[model samples]
Target chain A: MRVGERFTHDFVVPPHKTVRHLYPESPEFAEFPEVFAAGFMVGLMEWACVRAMAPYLEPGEGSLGTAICVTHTAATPPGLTVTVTAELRSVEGRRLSWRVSAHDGVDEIGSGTHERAVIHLEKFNAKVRQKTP
Target chain B: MRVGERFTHDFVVPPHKTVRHLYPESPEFAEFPEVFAAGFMVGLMEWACVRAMAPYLEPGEGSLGTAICVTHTAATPPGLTVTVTAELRSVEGRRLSWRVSAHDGVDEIGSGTHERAVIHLEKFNAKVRQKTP
Candidate 1:
């Protein structure tokens, strides 16, 4: 993706996206009813980055997450909307870096840098198949 | 939490945990079968770390993910199980640091350092409530 590119996405926190749902078997987190899972927040950030780079990719090409460095500053309960933005910070051939931030309609929840690498879908799939018996 | 403590967990990569189910509305990932979404991998890693610190937490305390720096080195397909290990590297009062690593049935999939901070559940929930209108 080209540097300076940007994209934004908004999503509502559903009950299934809560910490309890993420680790349902764990009694500790399972009882946590009003908190959004940090792991899902990471996915939302990555989703925004992937969307930011979507238009730049060629057919049969996609991006894969390589590094994530973000902070989950606040807890968001179900029903609130969270908006995430990704700004292309740099591009090193296939590697892309983005400055990402998110706000859950009420407060700033997270901010950090995320890095991803573009890959040829066919080649990536083949590499995955190599792991099979 | 004390530094130097370690824990391990193993989980099977089920179909519901696949990429398509993560972002079901997206036709792109939905049609691409046999792939484990990177987002789910992040959750798995976090789950392991949380489990590692479970025993050390007090009755009304918990840990929240503040930062994640990891590399997803390989792609894993469905049906294969993965194992993750977390080692407490340092402890600074309410903050904790862990060296985390993961391997699927065939190859090492990821490695990174994750940082989390301990929190009083009731206080943390109060902070969350403040975000409400």
Candidate 2:
């Protein structure tokens, strides 16, 4: 795996159609503010970063995310365009990590580190379900 | 603190103004597939659950989130409506736990367990910055 390498995903910020009723009196209909609720944007950025690293792995390969830490420093409004970019920062032994950042045309909004470990999907998921039952 | 109690928060879904450019031709502009990008919905549900527990906490009382596990079982399209509900499942010593759930008026969209530990605000933020440099 290549460290210090970057990958970018251009994602559109959808309007508040799904979350608009919460603040009907508000003016900005496009920016849903609910994005913070969905954990949607960050998940997408993480997925993009993982996809960037996917080419190196075979069909049977997989990784289990161990930790994700971030600061949601800014609020994204409606009708605005934003881009989330992630970079592979380190890969030590069985552990892999990435540095991620997001932008919304006007400024930098969020950044943080995401850590994951390559593992057998079946084993990892099995462990997850075991926690519930 | 009380255990086995439940709390709820109602969040509004906004239209897809900022994320619309990503898919202009699509009929549904309200559901910005990007909420997945913002980690928006899940984050909101987490916040609401925390808020429900906040009133019982002292002004200086704080909690550090240790882990959050969830499943986004359904997709929320633009211009749709949804509600998220959370419950206090257990409180063991300084460690507090909650069960969270979400609905978009049509079905159960998400649910999970969120774990947090009570802590001193000053110490938590201080330790966070220490990790940066």
Candidate 3:
């Protein structure tokens, strides 16, 4: 991946994607009222980062998140759209780093750095397979 | 939430939860091979930290992830179980921090610090509602 490359991703936070709905099995989470889940926000950011590198990876090659340092600073409700932008900051061999930022329709929700390592799908899958029963 | 509290969560890495399986809408991810998705690992860690504070919150109160700083160091295949533990490191006003770690049946896969802010569900939802159309 080359530095300075950037991309943006957008998604509407629906009720099903909210904290209360995603983890229905959790009676604890069930106790809370509906709102965007932080976990899903992280997923969205990861998705943005992955998409930013998609054009660069070869067949059977992808990146995996190695580190994330982002904050969810605002409460975003369902029906509100959130947009995330990821910019390539550095590259070291197979390691790709990014500066990511997000904004809901109303506010800049969060920003941080993320690191991902590129791997051949075949090798990565083989490694995982060996760990399986 | 009080500092020093700890909790653990465990889940099997099922095929349906894999990256290629989860984001089927994306023709890009569809081309990749199967394995645990890093996004889901972040979700797992967030769930653990939320659970760690579950008992402490009163009704209509919950914590949302604010910051995450973690690394996914190993690949885990489907059917292998992964366990995540979250330790409450500190508490300041409505902010809570955690030290989190994870291990698969065979290896330590990841660890990092996470921060969350406690919010009353009603007020949080109201804030979200204001942002919605």
Candidate 4:
């Protein structure tokens, strides 16, 4: 979408989430593999924005995950349903910026700015593998 | 070090530091290759603690990077000297935890908790590569 526009993705904070705390099976509660699970949650939200905008974006023509700033303000227990909102804040040429937020029911949990530039997926991933490798 | 006992790592913050922001030749300021560089900075401080404690603890026994919760409070412009401090908080078996903070001169830029479990380098990397693959 365009600047000042917001799109939302509803997500369930699954019980006994496996990725974060490495918490195994629990009928009622989810656990994080680590305390940083919240940060990972934020990352997931940001990734959602890109996924939502993908149909309109040109692959390998957009910058992917240029930057993300987040505040992990609250702790999410297992089974808490969360929603993340990505509101386009600015557009400068190929660059797309958004004001992002996350919440569970009544509380505003986290907020941050995420910047991504439209880029080709192949080139981005190629460069990424090279750099990290 | 204990939870209430905070120790500071006086880091130069460097002029155009290399790791996060890939800014190379700049006489004045620094730049991050990605916006998530701040998060990487927090990771570095947490790593520092693990490095510092290496001489004291047993190897292949600790859990590294259990979880981290952070707030990327302010944007750090390059060339600003940054300092990161880590404080010991909890010790449970192989898990060693710390509260980590990053500062750019006058500003407290980021804060988080890093949980580490000491482990054998070979096994950790083996498991890591497997999961990512």
In order, the candidates keep a fraction of the true contacts of 0.45, 0.17, 0.68, 0.00
Candidate 2, residue B59: the lDDT equals 61
Q: Higher-DockQ candidate among 3 and 4? A: 3
C-alpha RMSD for every candidate: 2.1, 11.0, 2.1, 12.7
- The residue-level lDDT of candidate 3 at A93 comes to 89
* Pairwise DockQ winner, candidates 2 and 3: 3
Per-residue lDDT of candidate 2, residues B1-133 (tens digit): 5677777776555544223332343333222233321255545655666676666566666654445566555445444555767788887766777877787666577777777666665655454334322
Residue-level lDDT tens digits of model 3 in B18-133:
77644455666776656677767777788888877776677778777888888888878788899998998998778889999999888889999998888887887777677777
* Candidate 1 residue-wise lDDT, B28-122, digit = tens: 56555466777677778778888888877889988887778788887788778888889899877788889988899788988888888888988
Please give each candidate's TM-score. 0.90, 0.49, 0.90, 0.48
Compared with the true structure, what per-residue lDDT tens digits does model 4 show for residues B1-133?
A: 4555666765443323332232122211121232234434544564456555555565444334545555555444445556767788887666677777777665576776666665665665454334331
Candidate 2 vs candidate 3: the lDDT winner is: 3
Over the true interface, candidate 3 deviates by an RMSD, in Å, of 2.0
Model 1 clash pairs are none
Q: How close is candidate 4 to the true structure, as a TM-score?
A: 0.48
The lDDT of each candidate is 0.80, 0.57, 0.79, 0.53
Off by over 4 Å in 4: A16-36, A59-62, B1-133
Score candidate 3 by lDDT: 0.79
Q: Higher-DockQ candidate among 1 and 4?
A: 1
- Looking at model 1, residue B64 earns an lDDT score of 86
